[PDB]
Write a protein that binds this DNA or RNA. Structure first.
Length: 756
DNA sequence: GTACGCAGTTCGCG
DNA sequence: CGCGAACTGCGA
């Protein structure tokens, strides 16, 4: 099983290292034969003699083109002639590529920003994370001494906890009477013992929760301050801190540093992403938080260090448990994308699609388009029309079916062969024509993306079959993870077409896909109303709710089935409308806001405050209980009484302040805000106290009693002192609970004033 | 990764 | 000094 690749330099030459786990043994394979390269498109072949002479400078050393070769390739499916330019070292390419591109005989250059070790995995056809190999994992976490207004890692690490299958332990340099605590004499001795623990356990994976931006950078700054060779790598190297975007990332050679934080952010939508919140959300068990101030107090007074050590131990333990849950998933993603787990677990959706496409392009001798430069990026900022949203027939409805298309956009892409290499391609004998926008797509050969998308959907169907028949539960689970990742990838192509930084960006493809989608959904709506007497209540992009006014439940279900058989004989190719469910009652608030209940009593909602992080729990729980009284009990009067009891508890300050927390993430640098709201005002006061605030930080605040701007009265919740602070009961009644429920109950004649 | 949509905060204008 | 526009977050 391949775990990772990198390269080192030997006498000026790159040597690829393939880190492997085969039959339980860590192994490094070395490859000295791989040459870095990129491509140049020339105005005339004779010009290669001049291009060959171009030089540049690296670390004082002259950079030259090593060797050149004319190759034939395809660009968007058309033959093209380019020159492959070879170099001695991969660091030669960034040094020289601009001077070559700028040459007057060079039209353009291609595949010039592909990192050498990832180039290697593609060109050799190697796939990471294949095989039945069991990886050894170890989570760890640190606890530190913090003083307000200090510089990063000015204070010592107090505890290092670690956990694996055999349990969890805490190393610390004060005496703590717990059986899982190992006591050492100093911070230095604690770090050194932790190093020895890692070396002795020799894990394949190190699991952290936010180790990329806290724990490893803290350990490095302490190791520097203390003069410790932080030799975590299997080659004896120290952890490598890399800048990645607005943030950092930490790699450990010969291991995989698995930081759960970016994995969870792009996998689960949660109100906050504290370790405690993620743990409870995933396993349903509570984890108590101990705050820095309590840690510092406990360390400085020596009082109650057992609480701190238990917190530290639980940190490592739940980090291990979350690692066990999420690593096999990401490992299947790594295998599907064909790049290392380290890279893939940290990569955005668009980047994941692009690396998969780069590999498929290589396999098909297709030269890759470049990422856009600044000019082209500005060219690509125009938008296009999206999905169809019908204005709902607002109110309460009965006996509702929901019908939707199976993977509408992937089905359109495959059926109509929507791809940049088929778009308006001349000389074909069959075309499909996008409605409204008019773009033509040739059908004479599978387009690059349709062909890949069809293979993905097919393989996903084969995997589900093998799952049902396999007796190995491990294989079945890993197959499950793979088929789920394939589905996600399949559903990512449409958005990637519209992604202005995409190599294979194609606005014409994107808007053809949404144009066909609008046509298919509005055609279906028109047919079910005109030929089957349904009334469509609401529709958004790829499905609709409908009923037959005055018909009983079984008539609506039967007639819906008859309509499906009718309509699906009219839909071409992969398009398929399906019966998604039957709902006894549904309430439609506005576009994108509804709630329905099935015949078993389960309520599902779209777009309602109940799922939003920026609405307080008191409002969300009140909305949930109202929806229960209406859809499940038909008891409007009960729902009204519920809102009144809630507002009465807020008025008497009887609601627990925990239910009053609002969460809103910071989306940009604090400097770039044109307007300041509550969460921005709270972020700025925190940052004014030294607190790191980056895009993606979730501000969790509560609104206190007073007047003026809400922003002026908002404090972070973990500063809420129930004696020094009184929350704004009128705000939570008037701006949170009542708005969330008024838009529902007004359909029955009530206004806000009747709900207090 | 995309477009479409609601709606709460804040501010400024007339 | 009510009303709307800008800004903002997050919801197929």
């Amino acid at each position: 099983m391949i775990l990772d690749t990198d390269y080192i330099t030997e006498d000026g030459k790159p040597v690829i290292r393939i880190f492997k786990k085969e039959n339980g043994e860590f192994k490094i394979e070395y490859d000295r034969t791989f040459e870095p390269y990129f491509y140049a498109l020339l105005k005339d072949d004779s010009a290669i003699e001049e291009v060959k002479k171009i030089t540049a400078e690296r670390h004082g050393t002259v950079v030259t083109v090593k060797r050149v070769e004319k190759v034939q390739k395809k660009f968007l499916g058309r033959p093209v002639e380019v020159w492959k330019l070879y170099f001695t070292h991969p660091q030669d390419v960034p040094a020289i590529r601009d001077k070559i591109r700028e040459h007057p005989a060079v039209i353009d250059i291609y595949e010039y920003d592909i990192p050498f070790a990832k180039r290697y995995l593609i060109d050799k056809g190697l796939v990471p994370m294949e095989g039945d190999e069991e990886l050894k994992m170890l989570a760890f976490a640190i606890a530190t001494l913090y003083h307000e207004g200090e510089e990063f890692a000015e204070g010592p690490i107090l505890m290092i906890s670690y956990a694996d299958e055999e349990g969890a332990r805490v190393i610390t340099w004060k005496n703590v009477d717990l059986p899982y605590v190992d006591v050492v004499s100093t911070e230095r001795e604690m770090i050194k013992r932790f190093l020895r623990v890692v070396k002795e356990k020799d894990p394949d994976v190190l699991i952290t929760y936010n180790g990329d931006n806290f724990d490893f950078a803290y350990l490095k700054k302490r190791c520097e301050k203390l003069g410790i060779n932080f030799a975590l790598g299997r080659d004896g190297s120290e952890p490598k801190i890399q800048r990645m975007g607005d943030r950092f990332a930490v790699e450990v050679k010969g291991r995989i540093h698995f930081d759960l934080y970016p994995v969870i952010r792009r996998t689960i939508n949660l109100p906050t992403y504290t370790l405690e919140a993620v743990y409870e959300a995933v396993f349903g068990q509570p984890k108590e938080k101990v705050y820095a101030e309590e840690i510092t107090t406990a360390w400085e007074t020596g009082e109650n260090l057992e609480r701190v050590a238990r917190y530290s131990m639980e940190d490592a333990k739940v980090t291990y448990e979350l690692g066990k849950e999420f690593l096999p998933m990401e490992a299947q993603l790594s295998r599907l994308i064909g790049q290392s787990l380290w890279d893939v677990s940290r990569s955005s959706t668009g980047n994941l699609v692009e690396w998969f496409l780069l590999r498929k392009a290589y396999e098909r001798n297709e030269l890759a388009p470049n990422k856009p430069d600044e000019k082209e990026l500005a060219r690509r900022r125009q938008s296009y029309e999206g999905g169809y949203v019908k204005e709902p027939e607002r109110g309460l409805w009965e006996n509702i079916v929901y019908l939707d298309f199976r993977s509408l956009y992937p089905s359109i892409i495959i059926t109509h062969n929507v791809s940049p290499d088929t778009l308006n391609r001349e000389g074909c004998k069959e075309y499909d024509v996008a409605p409204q926008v008019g773009h033509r797509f040739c059908k004479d050969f599978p387009g690059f993306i349709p062909s890949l998308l069809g293979d993905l959907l097919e393989e996903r169907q084969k995997i589900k079959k093998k799952m049902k028949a396999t007796i190995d539960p491990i294989e079945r689970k890993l197959l499950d993870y793979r088929q789920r990742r394939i589905k996600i990838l399949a559903s990512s192509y449409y958005g990637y077409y519209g992604y202005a930084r995409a190599r294979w960006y194609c606005k014409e493809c994107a808007e053809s896909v949404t144009a066909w989608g609008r046509e298919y959904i509005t055609m279906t709506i028109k047919e079910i109303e005109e030929k089957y007497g349904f009334k469509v209540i609401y529709s958004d992009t790829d499905g609709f709710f409908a009923t037959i006014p005055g018909a009983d439940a079984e008539t609506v279900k039967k007639k819906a089935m008859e309509f499906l058989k009718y309509i699906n004989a009219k839909l071409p190719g992969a398009l398929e409308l399906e019966y998604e469910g039957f709902y006894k009652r549904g309430f439609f608030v506005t576009k994108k806001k509804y709630a329905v209940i099935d015949e078993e009593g389960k309520i599902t909602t779209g777009g309602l405050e109940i799922v939003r992080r920026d609405w307080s729990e008191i409002a969300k729980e009140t909305q949930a209980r109202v929806l229960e009284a209406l859809l499940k009990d038909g008891d409007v009067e009960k729902a009204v009484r519920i809102v009144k009891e809630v507002t009465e508890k807020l008025s008497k300050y009887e609601v627990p302040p925990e239910k009053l927390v609002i969460h809103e993430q910071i989306t940009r640098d604090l400097k770039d805000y044109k307007a300041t709201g509550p969460h921005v005002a709270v972020a700025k006061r925190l940052a004014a106290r030294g607190v790191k605030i980056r895009p993606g930080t979730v501000i969790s605040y509560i609104v206190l009693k007073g007047s003026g701007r809400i922003g002026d009265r908002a404090i972070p919740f973990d500063e809420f002192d129930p004696a020094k602070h009184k929350y704004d009961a009128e705000y939570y009644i008037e701006n949170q609970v009542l708005p969330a429920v008024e838009r529902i109950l007004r359909a029955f004649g009530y206004r806000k004033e009747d709900l207090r």
